[PDB]
Design a protein around this ligand. Structure first.
Ligand code: ARG
Ligand code: MG
Ligand code: MG
Ligand code: MG
Ligand code: MG
Ligand code: MG
Ligand code: MG
Ligand code: MG
Ligand code: MG
Ligand code: MG
Ligand code: MG
Ligand code: MG
Ligand code: MG
Ligand code: MG
Ligand code: MG
Ligand code: MG
Ligand code: MG
Ligand code: MG
Ligand code: MG
Ligand code: MG
Ligand code: MG
Ligand code: MG
Ligand code: MG
Ligand code: MG
Ligand code: MG
Ligand code: MG
Ligand code: MG
Ligand code: MG
Ligand code: MG
Ligand code: MG
Ligand code: MG
Ligand code: MG
Ligand code: MG
Ligand code: MG
Ligand code: MG
Ligand code: MG
Ligand code: MG
Ligand code: MG
Ligand code: MG
Ligand code: MG
Ligand code: MG
Ligand code: MG
Ligand code: MG
Ligand code: MG
Ligand code: MG
Ligand code: MG
Ligand code: MG
Ligand code: MG
Ligand code: MG
Ligand code: MG
Ligand code: MG
Ligand code: MG
Ligand code: MG
Ligand code: MG
Ligand code: MG
Ligand code: MG
Ligand code: MG
Ligand code: MG
Ligand code: MG
Ligand code: MG
Ligand code: MG
Ligand code: MG
Ligand code: MG
Ligand code: MG
Ligand code: MG
Ligand code: MG
Ligand code: MG
Ligand code: MG
Ligand code: MG
Ligand code: MG
Ligand code: MG
Ligand code: MG
Ligand code: MG
Ligand code: MG
Ligand code: MG
Ligand code: MG
Ligand code: MG
Ligand code: MG
Ligand code: MG
Ligand code: MG
Ligand code: MG
Ligand code: MG
Ligand code: MG
Ligand code: MG
Ligand code: MG
Ligand code: MG
Ligand code: MG
Ligand code: MG
Ligand code: MG
Ligand code: MG
Ligand code: MG
Ligand code: MG
Ligand code: MG
Ligand code: MG
Ligand code: MG
Ligand code: MG
Ligand code: MG
Ligand code: MG
Ligand code: ZN
Ligand code: ZN
Lengths: 110, 116, 101, 53, 77, 141, 69, 181
RNA sequence: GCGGGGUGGAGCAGCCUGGUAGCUCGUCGGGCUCAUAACCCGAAGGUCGUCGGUUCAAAUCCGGCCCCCGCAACCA
RNA sequence: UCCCCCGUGCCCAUAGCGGCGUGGAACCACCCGUUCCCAUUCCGAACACGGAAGUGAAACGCGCCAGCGCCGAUGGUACUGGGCGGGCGACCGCCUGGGAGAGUAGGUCGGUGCGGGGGA
RNA sequence: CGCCUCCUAAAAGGUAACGGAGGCGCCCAAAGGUCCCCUCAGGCGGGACGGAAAUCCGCCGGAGAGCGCAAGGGUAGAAGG
RNA sequence: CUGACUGGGGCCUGUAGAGCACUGAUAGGGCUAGGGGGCCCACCAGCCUACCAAACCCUGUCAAACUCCGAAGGGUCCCAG
């Protein structure tokens, strides 16, 4: 018996894997916001970035943008360039949107 | 639904306006106007809120009205019908109670004629 | 063992022994030779269930207590043949397919 | 198609040529169709109007 | 005496057209079907009538993923 | 007499009568049984006639269990028509019966009373029969 | 909330017929009511209002005990 | 958030009394008011009145909140009802508006009811919620006799975080819900 | 076999186009007459042969079954 | 490499329903507000933002119980590719290779890959 | 008498009979494209007019609903709203 | 040298059999809305049913257009004779 959350999550993710790109998935909790780029072909995380691991500060939006840049910098160093944005159950807006725009600013391709 | 559960007709004289309440005729209307000292000839659209709250408070406390009065009339008949007395039979067949003729007339207790 | 002769049986009825035994969880050392059941109070048409089964020590019911176990039912009668034969049967209707179903 | 469900043409409002054929219900959609379609003559999208077939 | 029956429709010749281990080219039809009995997998697209067709040159593979249904894959060569 | 109250489909292909019974091969209600020895389509007219024989024997008493039901529609074209012009009309219903099935069971009657009633009913049937009583083999099923 | 579609709630004063004033919020600041919880017969314990009768029937005759015995 | 009479009463007199009477080991196990959902099942506005905005305007005064429309989920011959027809209103009052409504309902409306002999005790969900029905909208103070064209009642749903009827019965009576038995 | 019907007590509409049962007669009540017929003024009564189905809803569309009308049943 | 949590897959109910128990340091959650981004066919319920007083009550995670759900042998059997016999038939047997379903015994209140946060 | 669905059809495809059963000769300007949300039938309980069924509240409910129309396949991790 | 046929290997399938989880059928019993019937009432309910019986549960079964299951075989590609 699924929930609007689960279905929303599923529906947008299936759509992403179909295109077969590396996926920049984003979890966003009440305090923190994490992000990993995954190869669903192999079932393997390739590059990580999070507020909790970067010990970052105040405004969650401004924080996100920073973890976004963090992810992109670590990313390009690995040869990863293009990627697909898994917005999960979260509307592309605010914190999540900011994380994306940060990844873009950092030179990530999506 | 001002007093007492019924909203008495405005633009009419206060004595008659009270008769539109269940439990109050012209009689109990002449009473509550002295016992509260209000002019019987004035309109309800001309009543002081003071005159209002007094007439209301008195009438709801001195007499049994609307739903409760209807309740006892019902309760009074319910028992007469239940004890098995003649007064109860006439309430159970809907026939005239007060010893009138039933050969003709009696149209108010029965209802419109059912010809044959 | 259905000990006793039901009153329904005296009226001509028949004791239909639905369960002639019952499923039970129990110790191997604890196996009863049988289990008695009083059917003497059975009328047409009354019945007992596994709930009404009074058990020996150490044996536990493995079926629903709601499970019916025996009943007393009316007997065949030739008087029924005449009225059973007089019962006229209407044709079998059809569950339809398509714009009817 | 039918008596009420008609067939029609779409005429590029700029060069006046007919570029598409389709259908509509003239009881449900009594107004002349307006639709943006790619005109091969003009080589760009253009508003096309319903015109009698 | 007559009947209201007597009709039927042209057989539609549906089913799997390439089985697992078979080499296919880009565009080869793999499964013909009504609805999704098989679902498009790796390197496999689906047409407007649920037709499964190879997206790349390679070899076909089937995998049955339980409650997720059956899937058809083309493995690049 | 015995027939379905309704069905999805009116006419049924004839099928085949190969093999031993599918199930229903053990006593399950009464004390004594009547078992089919060879396959047949047993008509509703026969079943009822076989029943009536038994209740008539018991006069009053006993209980009759009928463990077969005619749900198969029997078809037949009108007299003197030629082949073709569709399938025939339904003229009765039969119960498909393969060797080994307990068709009838009696209960609540003396042994000699059951032996005779099942024998008599046996004569109304278009097949060979065998009378059987409840065993532990039946209990274990 | 959505703007412009909703009635504005402001501090309010519902005045009862017993003189009671209720501090609340409403779409209208002043209201006069004929009754409240503080004077309604069902609320105020069990004010018998006007019918403190006690049935009164059927033994309520006693008119009288003067008959012969 | 506005401090309101009935709300403050919940935390000061109602909250503790319940922890006493039932003995909860956690602060959230205590009964809370979830939401009050007011529904005007109307349907008198089917064909006849496409105009029932008076009732929306009325409910907007009562609850300080504009209701939404409810429409027919399926067509029905007997009610002269085709699928998708607008037959009712429903406003969901939560938080401070939920309190404000109940406060005015408990202190003013329920009393102004004709022959009000107490709310029905047995109208309890079983799952710990309560529902009650009014026959007039004149019961509310904001609605004078002048601004009413025709009578219309409503359904009131009160949802509780309570698991059982008894806990639900307590919370509401403590808040001031009068029952007949 | 092919076509057509079954609806107040009688005889016919309504069906094709789904929602909305109508006309004459008869019937009951009352007028006029000594009374009666005629005549005048009022009113009642059909869940549409059934069983199933389509639909939001069936006298109405569709199917099964009963019954009645008409035509056909040839070369052989 | 071992333990706990947050992510994300895989296997696709031995992983589920119900019952009980346990966890808030950290993480997650509910939670505190609705100024601001954004939002409600009404509702800050949801989505969203800014926060960090509280609580692990709901949720979720981890355990335990076989009442239900799910898995399920071995054995026998039905059926059968192929080879043969029998009956007037409906049908019935033999050899050889394959071999169910039901049921029985029994199993199960998950397993595992990658990445992070914490601990030893 | 052409076309569609199911069975007959003997577990690939195909397979006949005046064999068993139903449909089509339209439709939709949204009933189409995309993006973003939303999840049914039914059952028990609760609620003015309100009824077996109008709208509201709660719990249970893997899909038995829905998908314009026959049937089948499909399908809520949507193709449904 | 690719052929019929054959050895191994993968993949597709819904028949034989069987099953009742879906759609229907179904005998008996249990439990139990609905009627029918009787004592009982009009004042609104009772109560008993050797009556017809819904849904559900149990025992036992039926189906070309039912399938929770499901062979032997069969089709096809690869390597080999
Ligand atoms: N091994 C086999 N394939 N046997 C075939 C079974 C059928 C065969 N006609 C018989 O009666 O036995
Ligand atoms: Mg993996
Ligand atoms: Mg009066
Ligand atoms: Mg007199
Ligand atoms: Mg008299
Ligand atoms: Mg004929
Ligand atoms: Mg024909
Ligand atoms: Mg064909
Ligand atoms: Mg074609
Ligand atoms: Mg053909
Ligand atoms: Mg075909
Ligand atoms: Mg296939
Ligand atoms: Mg496409
Ligand atoms: Mg494989
Ligand atoms: Mg693959
Ligand atoms: Mg025969
Ligand atoms: Mg035949
Ligand atoms: Mg001839
Ligand atoms: Mg023939
Ligand atoms: Mg025939
Ligand atoms: Mg026959
Ligand atoms: Mg048999
Ligand atoms: Mg014989
Ligand atoms: Mg068995
Ligand atoms: Mg609190
Ligand atoms: Mg209750
Ligand atoms: Mg609750
Ligand atoms: Mg008012
Ligand atoms: Mg004919
Ligand atoms: Mg007639
Ligand atoms: Mg006509
Ligand atoms: Mg018409
Ligand atoms: Mg006359
Ligand atoms: Mg004379
Ligand atoms: Mg005359
Ligand atoms: Mg009908
Ligand atoms: Mg419908
Ligand atoms: Mg009908
Ligand atoms: Mg009609
Ligand atoms: Mg007909
Ligand atoms: Mg000639
Ligand atoms: Mg996890
Ligand atoms: Mg659990
Ligand atoms: Mg705890
Ligand atoms: Mg904490
Ligand atoms: Mg703590
Ligand atoms: Mg603001
Ligand atoms: Mg600001
Ligand atoms: Mg805004
Ligand atoms: Mg919030
Ligand atoms: Mg949120
Ligand atoms: Mg907890
Ligand atoms: Mg969560
Ligand atoms: Mg827990
Ligand atoms: Mg264990
Ligand atoms: Mg098994
Ligand atoms: Mg074996
Ligand atoms: Mg052979
Ligand atoms: Mg054999
Ligand atoms: Mg063999
Ligand atoms: Mg062998
Ligand atoms: Mg097995
Ligand atoms: Mg388990
Ligand atoms: Mg994991
Ligand atoms: Mg790890
Ligand atoms: Mg670690
Ligand atoms: Mg054609
Ligand atoms: Mg076929
Ligand atoms: Mg085939
Ligand atoms: Mg087939
Ligand atoms: Mg074949
Ligand atoms: Mg081919
Ligand atoms: Mg739209
Ligand atoms: Mg469409
Ligand atoms: Mg669409
Ligand atoms: Mg519902
Ligand atoms: Mg209800
Ligand atoms: Mg009611
Ligand atoms: Mg209702
Ligand atoms: Mg469906
Ligand atoms: Mg249709
Ligand atoms: Mg060679
Ligand atoms: Mg070759
Ligand atoms: Mg070859
Ligand atoms: Mg080979
Ligand atoms: Mg092979
Ligand atoms: Mg078979
Ligand atoms: Mg079944
Ligand atoms: Mg069973
Ligand atoms: Mg068979
Ligand atoms: Mg079978
Ligand atoms: Mg078949
Ligand atoms: Mg079959
Ligand atoms: Mg299996
Ligand atoms: Mg299985
Ligand atoms: Mg095989
Ligand atoms: Mg082969
Ligand atoms: Mg070779
Ligand atoms: Zn142009
Ligand atoms: Zn007061």
């Amino acid at each position: 018996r699924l929930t609007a959350y689960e279905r929303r999550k599923f529906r947008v993710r299936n759509r992403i894997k179909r295109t077969g790109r590396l996926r920049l998935s984003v979890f966003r909790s009440l305090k923190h916001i994490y992000a990993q780029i995954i190869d669903d072909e192999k079932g393997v995380t390739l590059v990580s970035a999070s507020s909790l691991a970067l010990k970052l500060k105040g405004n969650k939006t401004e924080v996100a943008r920073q973890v976004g840049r963090a992810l992109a910098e670590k990313a390009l160093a690995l040869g990863i360039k293009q990627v697909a944005f898994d917005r999960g159950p979260y509307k592309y807006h605010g914190r999540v949107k900011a994380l994306a725009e940060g990844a873009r600013e950092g030179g990530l391709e999506f | 639904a001002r007093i007492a559960g019924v909203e008495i007709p405005r633009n009419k004289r206060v004595d008659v306006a009270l008769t539109y309440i269940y439990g109050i005729g012209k009689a109990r209307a002449k009473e509550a106007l002295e016992k509260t000292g209000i002019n019987p000839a004035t309109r309800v659209k001309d009543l002081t809120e003071a005159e209002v709250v007094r007439l209301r408070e008195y009438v709801e406390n001195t007499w049994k009205l609307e739903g409760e009065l209807r309740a006892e009339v019902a309760a009074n008949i319910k028992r007469l019908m239940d004890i098995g007395c003649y007064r109860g039979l006439r309430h159970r067949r809907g026939l005239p109670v007060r010893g009138q003729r039933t050969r003709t007339n009696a149209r108010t207790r029965k209802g419109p004629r059912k010809t044959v | 063992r259905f000990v006793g002769t039901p009153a329904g049986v005296r009226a001509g009825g028949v004791l239909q022994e639905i369960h002639r035994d019952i499923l039970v969880k129990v110790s191997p050392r604890n196996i009863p030779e049988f289990i008695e059941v009083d059917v003497s109070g059975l009328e047409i048409g009354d019945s007992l269930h596994a709930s009404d089964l009074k058990l020996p020590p150490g044996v536990e019911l493995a079926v629903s207590p709601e499970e019916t176990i025996a009943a007393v039912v009316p007997p065949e009668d030739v008087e029924k043949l005449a009225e059973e034969a007089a019962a006229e049967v209407a044709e079998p209707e059809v569950i339809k397919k398509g714009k009817e179903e | 198609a039918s008596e009420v469900r008609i067939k029609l043409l779409l005429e590029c409002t700029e060069c006046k040529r007919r570029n598409y054929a389709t259908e509509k219900n003239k009881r449900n959609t009594p107004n002349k169709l307006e639709l943006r379609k790619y005109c091969p003559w003009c080589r760009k999208h253009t508003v096309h109007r319903e015109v009698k077939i | 005496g007559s009947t209201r029956n007597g009709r039927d429709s042209q057989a539609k010749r549906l089913g799997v057209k390439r089985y697992e281990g078979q080499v296919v080219r880009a565009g080869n039809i793999l499964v013909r079907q009504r609805g999704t009995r098989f679902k498009p997998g790796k390197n496999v697209g689906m047409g407007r009538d649920f037709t499964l067709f190879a997206l790349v040159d390679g070899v076909v593979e089937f995998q049955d993923r339980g409650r997720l249904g059956r899937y058809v894959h083309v493995r690049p060569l | 007499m015995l027939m379905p109250r309704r069905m999805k489909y009116r006419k049924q292909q004839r099928g085949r009568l190969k093999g031993a019974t599918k199930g229903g091969d053990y006593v399950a209600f009464g004390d004594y049984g009547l078992v089919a020895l060879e396959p047949a389509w047993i008509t509703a007219q026969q079943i009822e006639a076989a029943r009536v024989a038994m209740v008539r024997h018991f006069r009053r008493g006993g209980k009759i269990f009928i463990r077969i039901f005619p749900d198969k529609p029997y078809t037949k074209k009108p007299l003197e028509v030629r082949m073709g012009k569709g399938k025939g009309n339904v003229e009765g219903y039969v119960a498909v019966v393969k060797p080994g099935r307990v068709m009838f069971e009696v209960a609540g009657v003396t042994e000699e009373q059951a032996m005779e009633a099942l024998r008599i009913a046996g004569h109304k049937l278009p097949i060979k029969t065998k009378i059987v009583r409840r065993d532990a083999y039946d209990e274990a099923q | 909330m959505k703007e412009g579609i909703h009635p504005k709630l402001v501090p309010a004063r519902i005045i009862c017929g017993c003189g009671n004033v209720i501090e609340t919020y409403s779409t209208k600041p002043e209201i006069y009511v004929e009754v409240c919880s503080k004077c309604h017969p069902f609320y105020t314990g069990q004010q018998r209002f006007v019918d403190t009768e006690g049935r009164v029937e059927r033994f309520q005759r006693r008119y009288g005990d003067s008959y012969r015995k | 958030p506005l401090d309101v009479a009935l709300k403050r009463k919940y935390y000061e007199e109602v909250r503790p009394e319940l922890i006493r009477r039932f003995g909860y080991q956690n602060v959230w196990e205590v009964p809370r008011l979830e939401k009050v959902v007011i529904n005007q099942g109307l349907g008198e506005a089917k064909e006849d009145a496409r105009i029932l905005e008076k009732a929306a305007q009325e409910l907007a005064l009562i609850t300080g909140q504009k209701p939404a429309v409810t429409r027919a989920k399926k067509s029905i011959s007997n009610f002269k009802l085709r699928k998708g027809m607008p037959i009712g209103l429903r406003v969901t009052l939560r938080r401070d508006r939920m309190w404000i409504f109940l406060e005015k309902l408990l202190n003013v409306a329920l009393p102004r009811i004709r022959d009000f002999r107490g709310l029905n005790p047995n109208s309890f969900d079983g799952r710990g919620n309560y529902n009650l029905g009014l026959r007039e909208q004149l019961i509310f103070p904001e609605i004078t006799y002048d601004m009413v064209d025709a009578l219309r009642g409503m359904d009131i749903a009160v949802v509780t975080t309570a698991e059982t009827d008894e806990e639900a019965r307590a919370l509401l009576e403590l808040l001031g819900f009068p029952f007949r038995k």
